[PDB]
Amino acid sequence: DIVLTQSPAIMSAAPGDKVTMTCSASSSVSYIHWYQQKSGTSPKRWIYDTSKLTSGVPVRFSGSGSGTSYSLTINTMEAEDAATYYCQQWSSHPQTFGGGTKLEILRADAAPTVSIFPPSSEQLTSGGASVVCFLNNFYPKDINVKWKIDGSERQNGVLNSWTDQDSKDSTYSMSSTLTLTKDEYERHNSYTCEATHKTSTSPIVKSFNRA
Amino acid sequence: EVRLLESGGGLVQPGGSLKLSCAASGFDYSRYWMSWVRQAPGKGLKWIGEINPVSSTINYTPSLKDKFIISRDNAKDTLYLQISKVRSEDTALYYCARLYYGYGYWYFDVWGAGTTVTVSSAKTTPPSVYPLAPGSAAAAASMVTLGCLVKGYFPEPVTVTWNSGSLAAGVHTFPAVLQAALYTLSSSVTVPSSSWPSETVTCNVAHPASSTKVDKKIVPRA
Amino acid sequence: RRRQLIRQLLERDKTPLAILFMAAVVGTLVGLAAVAFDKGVAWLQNQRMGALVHTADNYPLLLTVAFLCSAVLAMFGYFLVRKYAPEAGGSGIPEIEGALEDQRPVRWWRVLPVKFFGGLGTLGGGMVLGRNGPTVQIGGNIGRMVLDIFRLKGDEARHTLLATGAAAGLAAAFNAPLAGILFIIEEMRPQFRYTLISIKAVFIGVIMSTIMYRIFNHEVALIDVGKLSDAPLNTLWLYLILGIIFGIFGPIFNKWVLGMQDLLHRVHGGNITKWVLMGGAIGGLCGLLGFVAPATSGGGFNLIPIATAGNFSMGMLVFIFVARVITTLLCFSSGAPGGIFAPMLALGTVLGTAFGMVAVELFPQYHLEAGTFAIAGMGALLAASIRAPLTGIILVLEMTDNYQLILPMIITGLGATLLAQFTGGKPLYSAILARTLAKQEAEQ
Ligand SMILES: [Br-]
Ligand SMILES: [Br-]
Ligand SMILES: [Br-]
Structure with missing residues (x-):
């Protein structure tokens, strides 16, 4: 089959700025199509026959290419241009998509608003203890979380999850959850959650003591 | 409007089977080739197969004998996909697409929202x-x-x-x-x-x- | 000659009232004639069917009553041609073409009865021959007859009334009005000189002819194919390919009809008794093959929708094509009264289907339907053998109503007529007239 390879697999770009992703084929391919997909949404036919815009696709979008290399381009990025862009060939059979190119907004750096949360009395009664840490509304997305129990590092029983880049403010967010049994939770007193971003060298520790 | 509404995706136990359904509204659904494409968790688009308006030709991706069965009933205006001996590789969002062309290099004209298949014991x-x-x-x-x-x-x-x-x-x-x-x-x-x-x-x-x-x-x- | 043109321009399209009204009556009669001829053919094929059931036990007597029923009807049709009008043999388009050149007579007092009754014999037995040939000659002769009855004088009247009769004749045979006019304007007209064939008058006759046919035929179409798919631009080059294959085949088929006319003349030498017996054996073979392998015999209109829908295997299509090439030559080259036009639609369809089904398996990215290539090929043997492509294209369009295929239909037809020219073939009606005018002189 034909293998299509989209190039900047992820990439960011400021609004009103010129973006360009690539599609590349193991063999020669003709009249490539491009679909745009936002999360939760059906893919939308975006560009077809290497160069033709679909009804509604704003004029800022454009395609080009030949034989073994093709391209999509947005002369002036907008914000609603944030999505994943899949290239597609049916010059050969069977037809093959590309791996994708995710394109997200670029914005000013922001620090995480860190928030720490003790196990609810509801979960304790059932025997388990989860300590939840929210690191909310930060950019860029690379961040580190570390947990200390009575000021000692802990690594086991930790699970983190990043949101996708936010719609309005174009930040990120990332929750960290340390799960123990109620018994282990009760042996200790000081639970601290330490966010190491890049907007500083001094992590933003938040913490509580059961006392 | 033209709408594709695919349903039938849920939790199914490994080695099971399931029958997905795409309901077409707002265009003559005869006339059109129909297609299935799936997206596995955090991964790209994969073509399953296509059926022509008279079910006289049905093509499938390079994939095993009675794995997929695509069929259509242009009377009820609905497209079908049976998956058999389902393994976790079949865990995916499943898309139903209407096919067309411009110069004649076929593309995926309009897509539905999807249904999710989860295969797990x-x-x-x-x-x-x-x-x-x-x-x-x-x-x-x-x-x-x-x-x-x-x-x-x-x-x-x-x-x-x-x-x-x-x-x-x-x-x-x-x-x-x-x-x-x-x-x-x-x-x-x-x-x-x-x-x-x-x-x-x-x-x-x-x-x-x-x-x-x-x-x-x-x-x-x- | 400028002031001459100013006058002529100012005198354009003023056909005489008498020719226009007479054009109307010519069409009406040609219509009624074609309807009658059409029902007569059908009624005998039925009698022949109902005979095979009073005899459906004794398989041997079955194949015998199939053979002799069509043998008798065939000979009868051969006999009346040689005995009373020899220029009613074969198609008749070449003689009505000759009549338009004023070098063959329109012996209407003899051809009307023999062509009508002789055709019923050969078509009604199930021979591979069409209604077109008959209905256009019958229609031309009917033109002459109306001319002689009303003693209208002039070159205009004789040429137009003769043209409208053969136009109304094709129209009524196919429920194809636009094809009839065009057949005159592209093929049957005197091809090397101006003529005063009024076209507005040919139009009137075609209308009335077609109205007569609709009066006795409505609600059922000669060929129903449904709506097939469209053709993408990047598919067009495949129809050109198919054309080129028809363009090479066209002339080769034309050699066969002509040299086959030669060969089978050797058999009877010209003797009306050996000849009628020869047509009796050809007729019996068709009425027999009509039972044992129907797609090998008959006019072929039945298997056109079947082949277009992809319901034949490739093996069958090759078989049918070979066989029908064979039974088509035997029947038309024999000189039995009846056309070769309609069996060429069949041969074209069958071939185009076989090309289509190869094209579907070689290019799944094209999303082909073999039927679109059958529709492109139907008027293609017409384009490469008789070289009237504009008429085949408009005829196939009128009969199958898939106008979205107009481009691949044009493209296939032009490639056929281009490769027929380029490989040294000639228009078959013209090469049949030419050989006929070449012994209407070599006897001196
Ligand atoms: Br002839
Ligand atoms: Br005919
Ligand atoms: Br003919």
Whole structure:
């Protein structure tokens, strides 16, 4: 089959700025199509026959290419241009998509608003203890979380999850959850959650003591 | 409008079978080749197969004998996909597409929203919903972050709204993580400290796979 | 000659009232004639069917009553041609063409009865021959007859009334009005000189002819194919290919008909008794193959929708094509009264289907339907053998109503007529007239 390879697999770009992703084929391919997909949404036919815009696709979008290399381009990025862009060939059979190119907004750096949360009395009664840490509304997305129990590092029983880049403010967010049994939770007193971003060298520790 | 509504995707046990359905509305569904494409979790688009308007020709991706069966009934205006001996590789979002062409190099004209297939021997399991209140001696600032933890449910998905969807600004819900055949996520909502605990903020959680609607009032601690 | 043109321009399209009204009556009669001829053919094929059931036990007597029923009807049709009008043999388009050149007579007092009754014999027995040939000669002769009855004088009247009769004749045979006019304007007209064939008058006759046919035929179409798919631009080059294959085949088929006319003349030498016996054996073979392998015999209109829908295997299509090439030559080259036009639609369809089904398996990215290539090929043997492509294209369009295929239909037809020219073939009606005018002189 034909293998299509989209190039900047992820990439960011400021609004009103010129973006360009690539599609590349193991063999020669003709009249490539491009679909745009936002999360939760059906893919939308975006560009077809290497160069033709679909009804509604704003004029800022454009395609080009030949034989073994093709391209999509947005002369002036907008914000609603944030999505994943899949290239597609049916010059050969069977037809093959590309791996994708995710394109997200670029914005000013922001620090995480860190928030720490003790196990609810509801979960304790059932025997388990989860300590939840929210690191909310930060950019860029690379961040580190570390947990200390009575000021000692802990690594086991930790699970983190990043949101996708936010719609309005174009930040990120990332929750960290340390799960123990109620018994282990009760042996200790000081639970601290330490966010190491890049907007500083001094992590933003938040913490509580059961006392 | 032209609508593609695919249904039939749920949880199925390895080695099982299932029959997905795409309901076509708002165009003569005869005339058109119809296609199935699936997207596995965090991965690209994969072509399954196509059927012509008279079911006289049906093509499938390079993939095993009676794995997929595409068929159509242009009378009810609905496209079908049977999957057999289903393995976890068949866990995917399944898309139904109407096919067309410009110069004659065929493309995926209009797509539906999708249905999700989950194949797993893990058993359906309702969520435990816990409130996340700020700690006893919380640093009561301008905006207060609250939360609730939705723990040990199977399979995906759950929906979280705050005050029945009225509280929409300052929410984000994190992607669920799976462990020991169970899913967990949490939801954050940031409000002004004039709002809470003066008014009530409640996370409403729904897990239809286990018929669970539950609301959780968030109350200050101690 | 400028002031001459100013006058002529100012005198354009003023056909005489008498020719226009007479054009109307010519069409009406040609219509009624074609309807009658059409029902007569059908009624005998039925009698022949109901005979095979009073005899459906004794398989041997079955194949015998199939053979002799069509043998008798065939000979009868051969006999009346040689005995009373020899220029009613074969198609008749070449002689009505000759009549338009004023070098063959329109012996209407003899051809009307023999062509009508002689055709019923050969078509009604299930021979591979069409209604077109008959209905256009019958229609031309009917033109002459109306001319002689009303003793209208002039070159205009004789040429137009003769043209409208053969136009109304094709129209009524196919429920194809636009094809009839065009057949005159592209093929049957005197091809090397101006003529005063009024076209507005040919139009009137075609209308009335076609109205007569609709009066006795409505609600059922000669060929129903449904709506097939469209053709993408990047598919067009495949129809050109198919054309070129028809363009090479066209002339080779033309050699066969002519040299086959030669060969089978050797058999009877010209003797009306050996000849009628020869047509009796050819007729018996058709009425027999009509029972034992119907797609090998008959006019072929039945298997056109079947082949277009992809319901034949490739093996069958090759078989049918070979066989029908064979039975088509035997029947038309024999000189039995009846056309070769309609069996060429069949041969074209069958071939185009076989090309289509190769094209579907070589290019799944094209999303082909073999039927679109059958529709392109139907008027293609017409384009490469008789070289009247504009008429085949408009005829196939009128009969199958898939106008979205107009481009691949044009493209296939032009490639056929281009490769027929380029490989040294000639228009078959013209090469049949030419050989006929070449012994209407070599006897001196
Ligand atoms: Br002839
Ligand atoms: Br004919
Ligand atoms: Br003919």
